Design a protein around this nucleic acid. Structure first.
Ligand SMILES: [Zn+2]
Ligand SMILES: [Zn+2]
Ligand SMILES: [Zn+2]
Ligand SMILES: [Zn+2]
Ligand SMILES: [Zn+2]
Ligand SMILES: [Zn+2]
Lengths: 87, 153, 377, 86, 176, 377, 176, 150, 86, 88
RNA sequence: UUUAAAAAU
RNA sequence: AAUAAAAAU
């Protein structure tokens, strides 16, 4: 299991998920919070849009990339990478 | 304390051992020849005047088997510990009662004589819990939860 | 530094003092000498290596010496060398195993080691490693010995910044030497050659040319109402002929035995039996001291067995009775005891025991004499 | 099954109720919304990270990974921990 | 009859680690007062043919015994792991084995000074924090964020030579 | 092993013996303490560092301390630190220069160095490095001082394995301290603060409150029938107030000066002129000591320039007479001498000299008095 | 009136090399007898403002003087090489400077033991050779085949610490 | 004999070649300060001045004759003269090296603080110097210690 | 201007007169051909190598090369050297 | 300058030559001893025949290759047999 | 007298 | 009392 952090519109969510889970399950998980259909939702990694059909292994990300102290950072879009606050 | 013992046995990963099938090997006389190794193994098992060592491959844990005469005095043993080869054609069965972190446990294992290797598993013990001193059990249970962080004034 | 031509008097006296149990001597000094095979000649090389006992195995004096020696060995490829060590501490276990490996690899070097103290002499692993390195006669022969007055004096002569003068031995040099020799003999499990046993163990009433007393000893322990042997504690020792640099007064074998008994740290709460075999019966002073020691230490029992009864001036009868009142049983070897000693304390090479003529008759005569001596007072 | 936290600067996190149960203040408070008067967004993120790590390794006793910290943020992270008794 | 046997989980280490443990314990017992009250029983004060040294830490009314063993059966061919160690917990006639990590945890509860109660409010006020924790082996667990943040703000003292921890004594560098 | 929390009593008594010239102290023991600006509070860190004098530069205790400090300083950039060293030997030349550079890079570290002995204080290159590290105020201040009874006691209380015993000063602690103080004052070219010169040097006939004698000195050498100044021999010193820990009977400035002179190693085959400028005339005992010193050292001529005549019980006139008869030239300070002293031994910051009231009249009166004293007998 | 000067050749070296030179010379003068007879004049025994020491080596009637110097500005910008060395050869009033290598060769002609005239005779007889050349720097020139062959046959002694040699003293490190 | 030695042996690590030389006094101080102090040292004659070959370790040191005292009159007396050239300074220094008497002649450009130097055989003082001492040194430098012992 | 040397084993070398002049035996003997009764061909090669080596570096006293030798050849090379009085 | 060794039919010559010297100069040098015209003679290096016109630089060999203690090894032929040295 | 041994340096 | 200092270890 790996932890992930999703940020968009200055809204953040933290969750744990399986390695082999595909992006469709990610959209299903975020649906229970954002209450919109998975289809229109599209993910982002390094400001690169993630197509509807995607998997962790195909993306190249591994369990080492996502850690409890260093989760993978991926943006989201609906039908802006806001940096964290500073001292 | 028995329900707490069971809960910890089932949920808390206390040692490098994970209470599952773990492969073990006989460590005695490695540099000696294979036939000599198993001959001495069987001779010691029958005679009972030597110590027997088994090591788990994936960890540094070892099970060292000491003759009961070496220790200064005989200890009361409500359970029975045994090491015999007769039950099988070439397999030796090992039963080891212990007390791990305050929970009484039985380590069971088997070893094939021909290959000088085998496996071991760990099982909860229920009968001896009531036998054990409740005073020491509860004192230990309290002691293993306390934290030195900010403990004193 | 690490290498030095010689060393100052202060360091020599501080480090080579050979008390069996010393603290604070954390440095190892290795005075090495190399000679060409065979006839005596000035050493082709000789220096000193230093090393902490807690430093990494590569920096120990022995490993450093062999690292240097390997490269030094590729100048005269076809020559065979003798090497002599004088080392304050006995080589560690790892150094012992590695020396065994190196000596097996290259059979063209002889190694002799002289040691002041015995480092960790009570460690089973160290004893096993020493047996491996030195015990074998078929395999690599690496001799080990304790340093005596002569060795220390030679080290002073050739390895000290001693402005020309004489070596003054410290207080108890001979006592410490005999203690360490006994301990090392136990560790390496020395054994008498058949000739000495034959010429000294005979029970003939009339003898000639045997003025030195031998002794063998083995400890045993009570457990589960049974005697259990200790293969750790077995060995033989003799008496020291008076010499200028040794004990000026002759030291009796029984006295060395008594001096060493305390070292084994025998537990008071237990019960031990010490079986001793002697070619000659204890003398008056020896018997007195043995009885005194037995009385003071109530956790030990003695079992003396004599080959030839010794009665020179009649004083021995009183000593035997004091031993008896102390609680030490006394007897004479029969055939069984003689054969047991032969098979336990001799390098018989597998040979069988060869009793001499009239052994049983003389043994019975000695038994009768001893019984008559002990019954009456 | 999630508790919403509002950063003092006006950011939003959501963390499972079990994770928030580790914090005494949030456990007592939990309504499904919480507002933090003084905790900045980064400090709220760091305390959420601490919750994540502790939950991941609460029971494991073998090969516990390290928890990186920085001196500049440590002071206010300790302040937030005190406030939350984490 | 069937043989009577006694069984014990014997950690396995090289001889050098045991000698370092012994040295450190002796030093902190005599020269320094940080380990005063600990008991060190020499090889001749135990009848067991295999025990090499026992260190007894009185945990108040209880006791913790660390036992080293010589000539153990492992008989490792390289000989690099021929000796061993063991940890046990005693109270009158009760006896149990303990984890190395739990062993130091229980040790640190009594002897080595740690952060006091007031250290949380001292950080809030910025007041100098003292006394500081010098025994990190006693907090191997997942501590509260308060303790971790406090440790990050103010680093532990690193005594020289290091304090004795069973965790360092009993670890497997060979396999890792 | 390089770092230790404390050292043993033998180590402290052997390495911190503060004799100006010690051999065989091949190790440099550096006790240190780190504190923060603000009220006095226990040190953040305090330990010891070790190293031979002949080891590689990167292993000297000073370089080790700065290597450790670089990393230990990451936690708080804003923090400004005070460092106190108690070092048996003063840093070396290379270490001195590298320390100068290190403190130059970090303007937030104030360092004080307490030395038991001065290492290679007669090396011109080391003197230049010391002046660059210490004297020059443009570079960050790195104070250096000799250790006194207080510093030795503080070390013994905080940097030794003492079992509540009490510090036992060795024989010549204060003598050696004063010698080292004068030598370091010479090397660092200390100067009198103007207020002290103004208060002590006035020649007014009647004054109150001045119980301390100040003595400035300078040496000159004969070459080609010319007086050539030794710029290395130039400084001043005051008397030591009596103290239980220091001198029970405080030394007069003259005694300290005569104790220092033998450590300049002035050549026997040359001729030296030593000029002293004082605020008080020598007393009776000081006069006899100076006279004896001059009599025995025929290669030294002494010239004295006093500001006021110190007379008590009538023995001072006899002292001056005998001092003059021994060979020394005694005179009184005039305007030229006052200005020379002001421009040489005082930190005048470029300011000029302001003669005080009645200076010439008092000088003339004292000159007449001295003429009467030296001529009448 | 024109100014007068004295002119010397000063091989620039660094402090540590001179220090080691002094230490080795003192050791072999006092601790060992190999350098017995050498005179070492301290810094305070010479009026010269720049001298730092003097080593006098009596070569029969003549003498060899190795001098070291202080505080010269000659040293490099890094100030590594602030010190210098120089070698003279004096006989009564006559004087002449000497090359470092020729200085070592001259030194070896008197003091340190070398191969005897019978060394080759014993070498071709197969018997032992006593003593052997212990000073290699004294044969800097490539010599007769006899020496090269004999040295190849028997390794020279290595004294510890190394014997003092001017060539090692004045060797050029950085400008190899 | 002396002339043959000088021409043949290339003795003493110097080959009597026009070699680069430079003034090294006060390398740390700025160029103008270096030049000023060099000029003052050359004129006053109370300080020391060193000239180093660029690519080697040898250096020629000029110390005031007062420092060593015990003055010895020297033929072809050494000199450091600025009269010959407005921008250059000439240096002449008699010496004795490995038993042969020589002169070292060089020049330094005060603007660049460097220049050239060379070695030249000296014929005059060679016959003046004591025959005994030079003969003894010549004998000493000829011998080899090897197999010399009895 | 070249002297001929005959190896006892059946090999031929030649070296200039000046090079051979360094050897006492050849210098006294020299006829334009030399025969050696005992010196093997390899030893003759080594001695000629030494001749050229010293002739090259007899005068130079700066950065002289090392002259390789091996212990197994040492005894015969020494015998040849003593015979040749080099 | 460099030193060289030429071996042919158990006959060897030791001589020095300049760096830039061409093989023609080498043939002239060996002419004084072998009494044969330069043209027909051919040299060899590592069992590789050398053309009539060859120079050191073109060949790539340098002063480092040839030393007085280890001169360049070259074979020769007339109008090849690399005979090794004898053995102990 | 004592050191079971890096208990120190 | 003496150590000019790697004269030591
Ligand atoms: Zn060792
Ligand atoms: Zn007797
Ligand atoms: Zn703690
Ligand atoms: Zn330094
Ligand atoms: Zn006075
Ligand atoms: Zn020689």
């Amino acid at each position: 299991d790996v932890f992930l952090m999703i940020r968009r519109h200055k809204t953040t969510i933290f969750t744990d998920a399986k390695e082999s889970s595909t992006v469709f399950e990610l959209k299903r998980i975020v649906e229970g919070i954002l209450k919109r259909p998975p289809d229109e939702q599209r993910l982002y990694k390094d400001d690169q849009l993630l197509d509807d059909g995607k998997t962790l292994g195909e993306c190249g990300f591994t369990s080492q990339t996502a850690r409890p102290q260093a989760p993978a950072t991926v943006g989201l879009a609906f039908r802006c990478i806001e940096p964290f606050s500073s001292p | 304390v028995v329900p707490d013992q069971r809960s910890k046995f089932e949920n808390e990963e206390f040692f490098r051992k994970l209470s599952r099938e773990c492969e073990i090997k006989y460590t005695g006389f490695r540099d000696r020849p294979h036939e000599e190794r198993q001959a001495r193994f069987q001779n010691a098992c029958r005679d009972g005047r030597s110590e027997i060592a088994f090591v788990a491959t994936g960890t540094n844990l070892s099970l060292q088997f000491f003759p009961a005469s070496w220790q200064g005095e005989q200890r009361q043993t409500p359970s029975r510990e045994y090491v015999d080869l007769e039950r099988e054609a070439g397999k030796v069965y090992l039963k080891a009662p212990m007390i791990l972190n305050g929970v009484c446990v039985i380590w069971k294992g088997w070893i094939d004589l021909q290959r000088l290797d085998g496996m071991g598993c760990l099982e909860f013990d229920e009968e001896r819990a009531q036998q054990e001193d409740a005073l020491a059990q509860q004192a230990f249970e309290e002691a293993r939860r306390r934290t030195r962080e900010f403990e004193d004034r | 530094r690490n290498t030095v031509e010689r060393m100052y008097r202060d360091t020599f006296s501080y480090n080579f003092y050979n008390r069996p149990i010393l603290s604070r001597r954390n440095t190892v000094w290795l005075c090495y000498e190399v000679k060409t095979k065979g006839p005596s000649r000035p050493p082709l090389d000789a220096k000193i290596f230093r090393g902490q006992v807690y430093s990494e195995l590569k920096y120990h004096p022995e490993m450093r010496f062999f690292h240097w020696f390997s490269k030094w060995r590729k100048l005269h490829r076809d020559q065979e060398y003798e090497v002599t060590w004088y080392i304050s501490w006995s080589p560690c276990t790892k150094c012992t195993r590695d020396m065994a490996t190196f000596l097996a690899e290259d059979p063209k070097v002889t190694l002799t080691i002289f040691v002041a103290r015995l480092y960790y002499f009570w460690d089973p692993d160290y004893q096993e490693a020493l047996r491996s390195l030195c015990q074998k006669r078929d395999g690599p022969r690496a001799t080990m010995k304790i340093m005596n007055y002569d060795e220390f004096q030679h080290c002073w002569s050739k390895f000290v910044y001693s402005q020309r003068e004489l070596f003054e031995p410290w207080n108890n040099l001979p006592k410490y030497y005999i203690l360490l020799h006994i301990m090392l003999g136990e560790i390496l499990r020395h054994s008498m050659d058949p000739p000495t046993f034959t010429f000294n163990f005979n029970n003939e009433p009339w003898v000639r040319g045997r003025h030195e007393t031998y002794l063998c000893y083995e400890v045993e322990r009570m457990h589960n109402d049974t005697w259990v042997l200790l293969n750790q504690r077995r060995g033989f020792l003799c008496n020291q002929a008076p010499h200028k640099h040794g004990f000026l007064e002759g030291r009796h074998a029984e006295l060395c035995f008594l001096d060493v008994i305390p070292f084994w740290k025998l537990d008071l709460d237990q019960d031990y039996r010490v079986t001793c075999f002697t070619s000659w019966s204890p003398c008056f002073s020896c018997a007195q001291e043995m009885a005194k020691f037995i009385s003071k230490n109530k956790h030990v029992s003695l079992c003396i067995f004599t080959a030839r009864i010794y009665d020179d001036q009649g004083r021995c009868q009183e000593g035997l009775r004091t031993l008896a009142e102390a609680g030490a049983k006394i007897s004479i070897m029969t055939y069984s005891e003689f054969k047991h000693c032969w098979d336990t304390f001799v390098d018989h090479q597998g040979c069988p025991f060869q009793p001499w003529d009239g052994l049983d008759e003389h043994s019975q005569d000695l038994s009768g004499r001893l019984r008559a001596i002990l019954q009456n007072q | 099954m999630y508790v919403k936290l509002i950063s003092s600067d006006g950011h939003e996190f959501i963390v499972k109720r079990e994770h928030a149960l580790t914090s005494g203040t949030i456990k007592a408070m939990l309504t499904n919304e919480v507002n933090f008067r003084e905790i900045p967004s980064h400090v709220l993120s760091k305390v959420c990270m601490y919750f994540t790590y502790k939950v991941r390794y609460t029971n494991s006793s073998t090969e516990i990974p390290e928890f990186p910290i920085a001196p500049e943020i440590a002071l206010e992270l300790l302040m937030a921990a005190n406030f939350l008794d984490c | 009859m069937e043989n009577r046997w006694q069984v014990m989980i014997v950690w396995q280490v090289d001889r050098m680690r045991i000698r370092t443990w012994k040295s450190l314990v002796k030093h902190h017992m005599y020269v320094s007062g940080k380990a005063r009250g600990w008991f060190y029983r020499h090889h001749y004060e135990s009848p067991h043919p295999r025990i090499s040294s026992e260190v007894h830490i009185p945990l108040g009314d209880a006791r913790l015994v660390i036992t080293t063993y010589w000539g153990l059966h492992t008989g490792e061919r390289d000989w690099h792991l021929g000796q061993g160690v063991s940890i046990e917990w005693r109270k009158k006639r009760y006896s149990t084995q303990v984890d190395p990590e739990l062993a130091d945890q229980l040790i640190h509860l009594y002897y080595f000074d740690c952060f006091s109660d007031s250290a949380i409010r001292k950080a809030l006020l910025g007041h100098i924090v003292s006394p500081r924790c010098e025994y990190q082996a006693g907090h191997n667990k997942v501590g509260s964020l308060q303790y971790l943040a406090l440790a990050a703000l103010i680093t532990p003292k690193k005594i020289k030579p290091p304090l004795p921890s069973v965790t360092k004594l009993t670890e497997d560098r060979w396999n890792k």
